[PDB]
Amino acid sequence: YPTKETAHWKPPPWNDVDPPKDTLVSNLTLNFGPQHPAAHGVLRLVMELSGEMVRKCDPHIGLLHRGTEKLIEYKTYLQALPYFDRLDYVSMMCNEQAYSLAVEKLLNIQPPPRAQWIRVLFGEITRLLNHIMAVTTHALDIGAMTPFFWMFEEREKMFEFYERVSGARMHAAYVRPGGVHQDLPLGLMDDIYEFSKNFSLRIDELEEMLTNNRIWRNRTVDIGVVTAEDALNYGFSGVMLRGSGIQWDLRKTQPYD
Amino acid sequence: PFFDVQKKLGVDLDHWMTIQSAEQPHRIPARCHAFEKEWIECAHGIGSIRAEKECKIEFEDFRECLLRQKTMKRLNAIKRQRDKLIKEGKYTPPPHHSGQEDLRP
Amino acid sequence: MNLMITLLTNFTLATLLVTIAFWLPQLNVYSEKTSPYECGFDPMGSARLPFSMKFFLVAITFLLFDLEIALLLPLPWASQTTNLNTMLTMALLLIFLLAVSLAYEWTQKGLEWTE
Amino acid sequence: MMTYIVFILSIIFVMGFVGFSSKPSPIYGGLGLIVSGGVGCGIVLNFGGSFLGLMVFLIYLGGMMVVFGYTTAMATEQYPEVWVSNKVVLGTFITGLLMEFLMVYYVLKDKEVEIVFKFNGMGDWVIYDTGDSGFFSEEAMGIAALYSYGTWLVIVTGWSLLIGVVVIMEITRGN
Amino acid sequence: MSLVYMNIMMAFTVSLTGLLMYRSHLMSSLLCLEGMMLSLFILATLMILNSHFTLASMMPIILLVFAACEAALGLSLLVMVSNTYGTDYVQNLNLLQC
Amino acid sequence: VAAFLKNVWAKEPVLVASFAIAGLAVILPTLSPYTKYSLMINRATPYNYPVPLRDDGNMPDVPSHPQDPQGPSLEWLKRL
Amino acid sequence: MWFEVLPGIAVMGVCLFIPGMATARIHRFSNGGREKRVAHYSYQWYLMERDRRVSGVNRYYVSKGLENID
Amino acid sequence: SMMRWNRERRRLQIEDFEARIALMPLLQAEKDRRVLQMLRENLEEEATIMKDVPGWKVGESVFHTTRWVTPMMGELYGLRTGEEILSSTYGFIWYT
Amino acid sequence: SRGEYVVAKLDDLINWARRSSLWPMTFGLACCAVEMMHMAAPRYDMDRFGVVFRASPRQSDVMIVAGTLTNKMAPALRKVYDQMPEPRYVVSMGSCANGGGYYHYSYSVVRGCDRIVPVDIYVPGCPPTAEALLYGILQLQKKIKREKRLRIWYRR
Amino acid sequence: MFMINVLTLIIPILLAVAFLTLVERKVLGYMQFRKGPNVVGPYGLLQPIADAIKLFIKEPLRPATSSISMFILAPILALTLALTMWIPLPMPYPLINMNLGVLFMLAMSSLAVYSILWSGWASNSKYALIGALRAVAQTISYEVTLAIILLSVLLMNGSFTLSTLIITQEQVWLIFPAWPLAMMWFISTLAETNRAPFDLTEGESELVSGFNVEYAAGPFALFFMAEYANIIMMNIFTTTLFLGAFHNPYMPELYTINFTIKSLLLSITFLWIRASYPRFRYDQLMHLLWKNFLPLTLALCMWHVSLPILLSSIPPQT
Ligand SMILES: CCCCCCCCCCCCCCCCCC(=O)OC[C@H](COP(=O)([O-])OCC[N+](C)(C)C)OC(=O)CCCCCCCCCCCCCCCCC
Ligand SMILES: CCCCCCCCCCCCCCCCCC(=O)OC[C@H](COP(=O)(O)OCCN)OC(=O)CCCCCCCCCCCCCCCCC
Ligand SMILES: CCCCCCCCCCCCCCCCCC(=O)OC[C@H](COP(=O)(O)OCCN)OC(=O)CCCCCCCCCCCCCCCCC
Ligand SMILES: CCCCCCCCCCCCCCCCCC(=O)OC[C@H](COP(=O)(O)OCCN)OC(=O)CCCCCCCCCCCCCCCCC
Ligand code: SF4
């Protein structure tokens, strides 16, 4: 018997199963902003999460956009040389080497052999500095802070080498187009030899405290797996390619000095 | 449908708990074990109608052991009359109810 | 009686330090100091939104296992009985039923988190 | 006044019950039920059963924290009516508190009230016992005798809990 | 009887009127249900400890065990309800009216 | 069944140890002979008061003094 | 060297030495030169109040020997 | 080692329980006499208070039997001061 | 008399307790952040002086601006400075935070962080050495020691 | 003279909390190739005083979007729960002798979580709610295994009384017949006290400062001394459980000094654990106490139920 109240009463479905009526689930949008020890200085990760599983990451960058490559155009080559120290402030001398190699290729001149050997040796020293900072800061982000203080003494020793050879601890402005700015002071290579003698044991104790710990393994065994094809397609280079199984290295395939 | 299985099979599942006068761990007696014993033995095998007619005295005495209505009622009467007598001024408490009397043991 | 004196002493020790931490120093309160902290930027929505939880099944079985261990705590007194074989059998059977429930959850992927 | 200790604990018990039975917000309902569980543990501890009070306190604290996680996941809104934020919640809280204090004043004046049963006016120290318990605690020995007497109770409780795990796992399946 | 019984049953009646009048939140009614079971626990153990029924001391543990089991069942049903609709409001359970 | 035991000890040794410990705890009170001594120790603990029986005249087994020879003694609890 | 933390460690040592020794001395003073009675069960409580009643000082640690009797 | 020490502790526990059992009759006699004396003191003062109230009979038992019942806590300490109330009723539970 | 003596002693006490418990927040942007955490290395070890990092702005005392302050960063820096409870102190590190440094004429670089926050100590260099930053921290401590807040209150 | 006893219990524990902050900062300096605070005073003995005075003259900073009642109530509850935690601990005589002290610690361990939860909820922050739900998950991970470990250990004691735990191991240490239970107990109290590698609540890397990311000075110090009192008493609880010392009723100071040295060494090992390992995930911890500790604990509970029946070694309950 239909009435006024029983006017919108539809019959139930034949299978008694309703459509799911999917309302918006209201994912929480967190802001992993720049004032955060996890973000490397300035990184505004706008992060859409379902509680804690990540659904979307949008890293807003440009908070450290100084506009280097316009002031470079407004200055000469020697004046634009210190601009390359401050791009990668923990791999400065390799940036100096890249800029010098580009300018030397454009100028059709080559450095002397001693400048080349000094360049390669100090590039390896800079690689040591960068890898120390990378591994120790990754461990500090995970939670193990002892290797950071353990190897930053060695980082201070290589900074002392930088200051002895150039007069500045970080931004040396030492590798220039045409070679290097100054010759090595006397007695530098012996101290390099002592430091290289002990650094194997330093790496050994860092590895012993990190590479076998099951808490360290659980945070790294199946995290951020990248296949080889997407590593090639996304423009990944270096350690990502070599860790995904791609046998690629610029020091072996397209060699310099 | 009280399909009584326990007496048919000979096992007991909740018979040891159902009354206050059953077997206890190292024979700890309840407060009204004797009254429950008297009421239970008064009204065994006579049915519920004859239980409420012919064991009213035992049951009401047991119920007074359980909740103690009349005991606190008499205590309330004594307490109220003593307070009114104290307030009016016709009574003084004895020294052994005041705090010291060189107690017995 | 001594426990309530101890609890009250602890409570008025705790509330004395808070009350002297709110009225003593000089205050400069503005409509920027008390904003929520979102790593330097303005938040995108409220903090009272539904924060969805993935470990709901583990919480429900935490209730059930908390009650299982609540049943299990009379064991030091129950070891002082005379019917020792029946007590031992019921203790073992209760713990075995707890382990059976845990194993059934383990084999059915109940402990694995959703999404 | 100190003879009315269980009376004061029961008045805090009813105060928490009417605080959380107004249903303001399940966070504050959780706080109210935590208060009620703690003071109920207190009440049953002055009656002698310390083990039972500690168990009910521990069990309710665990359950209340899990359900707090649930309402932070599920039962929450933009502006939770914590208290005083809604008219009906404040009205029913005040109504319950006024009714409770009214009957407390009534029983502390006539020393006898009749709501459907009949309740006496003195403290509950009168209904205690003057004897000793010897070298054992009655409640601990009863729950110890759960294992040696109550085998059927153990069987039905364990089976109910195991199938309860099965029930909750086959409920949250989705298909 | 004693006035502690008055307050315990009065708390039970408060939580009973709380459960039977909904406030558009199912979880609050679940909390009222746990309040009622807590009141039953307190009342039972008060009389059991007063009358020295020592064998009945195992009972309120079992009662609270089944209380928590039915609470867990209620929470699971609430997960299903909140996974169907946006929220846990009791007015959304009105499909069975036609 | 030896290959399965080797595999499960190679993969999850904690579950193997737990299963071994639980099996040990289940099957040891059946075969051990010291449990009856525990039963008698629990039985011989005097929680209550040993109320005496009225001497009708025919009860020579029950003693009349705690230092009488007849009755249940606890020498085995001293020796064990 | 590594023994310069030992000032703070020794300060923690005496700070944890303080409360236990304080409770021991307070228990030994407020109970007539003896250990505090431990009343776990009601039999011990009844005995303690029995001493409280026989002592006649309303202080149970005042202990009457067999010289009280005739 | 734990087995040896636990068996020794059980022997010591049995010795303590035997000492308590030997002490029981004297304490029971004093408890009976103290309870009866306190009931007689409460009854003798009950007549002095109840003189004006009509329809009252002193020493009335609320039970229908002549069997001796255990004295209620309020039937013993009903007329005494609150210090004894707190010392007897809640005294053991509150004691530390 | 006696009141000036009492407020001078109280000023000395609170100045010592504030200058010996500086908690800087974990805040860096650029090269100068690497030099700051090289000051926190075991060679110099600012934890000796009671100086220990605290990541949240609510539990920090001194803000160290180390790096280049761009236009996209200035509202975030200002907000984080505002959420820091009183008393708060600001130390400027490097030429970027001092006056823009290399990128003074850049279109998207704030010429000095003093346009945004009130700065107490300016530490010059590019990067200033770890000894230079420790010198700046000790200068800030000595500046805190010379505060006469309760003396000013008593005189006013 | 009970109030004097209460004061002489509650003042030295917070003094030792401040000096534990000193010692922790010094050890956390000295393991990582550097020094601790040694500038403020003679070998840095005045650093906790300076920290304490500094935190009580800073701004209180109650947020506008936060519910003020629970915001103020939570640190009071945290400090009071840490302070009443210490009451039945026998050193060698507890402040309050209790028949069931172990269940009192368990109930107050359940209650102390609520301070963290309500401080996370009241401060209207997403990071605070994240820290609160991580605390919830941590509690539902550890609590069952903690209670059942303590149950299966106390079966050889005979009762829940802590003073009986001195007598029950006066011959040999209780760490010998329950060494696996000792290790899982140590891990469970590492997880209970929110210390590394199971921090997961005050994470300075996944979050900024956790549930107290909005708490300014003063109220934040309440959580600091609450946590440090928690770690000291939990090491003391472990020392009483497994490392009981020789007790002379005529000279209690021998037991006090033995117990104090053992608990100090346990706290040194606690800070040693702090500066050695990376932090877990908050779901890897849930798969640790459930998939690895709980089955072995159920097996050990079967073993420790059957074993006193096996060897006729049932301890007295008196
Ligand atoms: C207080 C006194 C001292 C306490 C001891 C501990 C002090 C030293 C602490 C060291 C640092 C610890 C830092 C935190 C570490 C947290 C991680 C962790 O421990 O995880 C647990 C780890 C977990 O291992 P996992 O994380 O590698 O798990 C792998 C899991 N799968 C395979 C699924 C990937 O270990 C355990 O769970 C073991 C628990 C203890 C087992 C004890 C067994 C005792 C022996 C039994 C018998 C054996 C013989 C054979 C059978 C015989 C039968 C008769
Ligand atoms: C009878 C003894 C008493 C029994 C009752 C008391 C038991 C106490 C212990 C309770 C344990 C509860 C949890 C059990 C879970 C078992 C199922 C399971 O989860 O297996 C998984 C595991 C392989 O791991 P995986 O598949 O990777 O798991 C997913 C992520 N871990 O799978 C495995 O590792 C294999 C599991 C099955 C085989 C175990 C064999 C153990 C043998 C020990 C020696 C013999 C002991 C004597 C008794 C016979 C036992 C079979
Ligand atoms: C009516 C009469 C009373 C009037 C009110 C005043 C009462 C006393 C107030 C407290 C003491 C006030 C004086 C404070 C120190 C004054 C002198 C001073 O500043 O000395 C500086 C000196 C360190 O020199 P610095 O410049 O740091 O050197 C670098 C290292 N080469 O510093 C040092 O060498 C060490 C300084 C230590 C300061 C004292 C110790 C700390 C404070 C203790 C008391 C307050 C706290 C009590 C407990 C609170 C709860 C924990
Ligand atoms: C709004 C937020 C909340 C704000 C207020 C917070 C208040 C403080 C909260 C923390 C404390 C909660 C305490 C809860 C009850 C704990 C009971 C307890 O500790 O019992 C231990 C002990 C057991 O005694 P037993 O082992 O039997 O030995 C005696 C035999 N001679 O017992 C004894 O030794 C007996 C000592 C006397 C006991 C008296 C009865 C208990 C008093 C409870 C007072 C109210 C507590 C309210 C807690 C609210 C928590 C939210
Ligand atoms: S001042 Fe120099 S060293 Fe510092 S951030 Fe700027 S460019 Fe880098």
Swiss-Prot record, chain C:
It comes from Ovis aries. GO terms for molecular function: NADH dehydrogenase (ubiquinone) activity. This is NADH-ubiquinone oxidoreductase chain 3. It is a multi-pass membrane protein. One of its GO terms (cellular component) is mitochondrial inner membrane. GO terms for biological process: mitochondrial electron transport, NADH to ubiquinone. Core subunit of respiratory chain NADH dehydrogenase (Complex I) which is composed of 45 different subunits. Interacts with TMEM186. Interacts with TMEM242. Its EC number is 7.1.1.2. It is found in: Mitochondrion inner membrane. Keywords: Electron transport, Membrane, Mitochondrion, Mitochondrion inner membrane, NAD, Respiratory chain, Translocase, Transmembrane, Transmembrane helix, Transport, Ubiquinone. It holds the Pfam family Oxidored_q4. Core subunit of the mitochondrial membrane respiratory chain NADH dehydrogenase (Complex I) which catalyzes electron transfer from NADH through the respiratory chain, using ubiquinone as an electron acceptor. Essential for the catalytic activity of complex I. The chain crosses the membrane at residues 3-23, 55-75, 84-104. It catalyses: a ubiquinone + NADH + 5 H(+)(in) = a ubiquinol + NAD(+) + 4 H(+)(out). Belongs to the complex I subunit 3 family.
From Swiss-Prot, chain D:
It is a multi-pass membrane protein. InterPro entries: ComplexI_Subunit6, NADH_UbQ/plastoQ_OxRdtase_su6, Nuo/plastoQ_OxRdtase_6_NuoJ. Its main location: mitochondrion. Keywords: Electron transport, Membrane, Mitochondrion, Mitochondrion inner membrane, NAD, Respiratory chain, Translocase, Transmembrane, Transmembrane helix, Transport, Ubiquinone. The gene is MT-ND6. GO terms for biological process: mitochondrial electron transport, NADH to ubiquinone; mitochondrial respiratory chain complex I assembly. One of its GO terms (cellular component) is mitochondrial inner membrane. Core subunit of the mitochondrial membrane respiratory chain NADH dehydrogenase (Complex I) which catalyzes electron transfer from NADH through the respiratory chain, using ubiquinone as an electron acceptor. Essential for the catalytic activity and assembly of complex I. It is found in: Mitochondrion inner membrane. Its EC number is 7.1.1.2. This is NADH-ubiquinone oxidoreductase chain 6. Core subunit of respiratory chain NADH dehydrogenase (Complex I) which is composed of 45 different subunits. The chain crosses the membrane at residues 1-21, 25-45, 47-67, 88-108, 149-169. Belongs to the complex I subunit 6 family. It catalyses: a ubiquinone + NADH + 5 H(+)(in) = a ubiquinol + NAD(+) + 4 H(+)(out). One of its GO terms (molecular function) is NADH dehydrogenase (ubiquinone) activity.
Swiss-Prot record, chain E:
It is a multi-pass membrane protein. Keywords: Electron transport, Membrane, Mitochondrion, Mitochondrion inner membrane, NAD, Respiratory chain, Translocase, Transmembrane, Transmembrane helix, Transport, Ubiquinone. Its EC number is 7.1.1.2. InterPro entries: NADH_UbQ_OxRdtase_chain4L/K, NUOK/Mnh_C1-like. One of its GO terms (molecular function) is NADH dehydrogenase (ubiquinone) activity. Its main location: mitochondrion. It is found in: Mitochondrion inner membrane. The chain crosses the membrane at residues 1-21, 29-49, 61-81. GO terms for cellular component: mitochondrial inner membrane; respiratory chain complex I. GO terms for biological process: ATP synthesis coupled electron transport. Pfam families: Oxidored_q2. It catalyses: a ubiquinone + NADH + 5 H(+)(in) = a ubiquinol + NAD(+) + 4 H(+)(out). It is an enzyme of class 7 (translocase). The keyword tRNA-binding does not apply. Signal peptide: none annotated. Belongs to the complex I subunit 4L family. Core subunit of the mitochondrial membrane respiratory chain NADH dehydrogenase (Complex I) which catalyzes electron transfer from NADH through the respiratory chain, using ubiquinone as an electron acceptor. Part of the enzyme membrane arm which is embedded in the lipid bilayer and involved in proton translocation. Core subunit of respiratory chain NADH dehydrogenase (Complex I) which is composed of 45 different subunits. This is NADH-ubiquinone oxidoreductase chain 4L.
Curated annotation (Swiss-Prot), chain J:
It is found in: Mitochondrion inner membrane. Keywords: Electron transport, Membrane, Mitochondrion, Mitochondrion inner membrane, NAD, Respiratory chain, Translocase, Transmembrane, Transmembrane helix, Transport, Ubiquinone. The chain crosses the membrane at residues 2-22, 68-88, 100-120, 147-167, 172-192, 217-237, 253-273, 294-314. Belongs to the complex I subunit 1 family. GO terms for molecular function: NADH dehydrogenase (ubiquinone) activity. It comes from the Eukaryota. This is NADH-ubiquinone oxidoreductase chain 1. The keyword Transferase does not apply. Its EC number is 7.1.1.2. The gene is MT-ND1. It comes from Ovis aries (Sheep). It is an enzyme of class 7 (translocase). It is a multi-pass membrane protein. One of its GO terms (cellular component) is mitochondrial inner membrane. Core subunit of the mitochondrial membrane respiratory chain NADH dehydrogenase (Complex I) that is believed to belong to the minimal assembly required for catalysis. Complex I functions in the transfer of electrons from NADH to the respiratory chain. The immediate electron acceptor for the enzyme is believed to be ubiquinone. It catalyses: a ubiquinone + NADH + 5 H(+)(in) = a ubiquinol + NAD(+) + 4 H(+)(out). GO terms for biological process: mitochondrial electron transport, NADH to ubiquinone; mitochondrial respiratory chain complex I assembly.
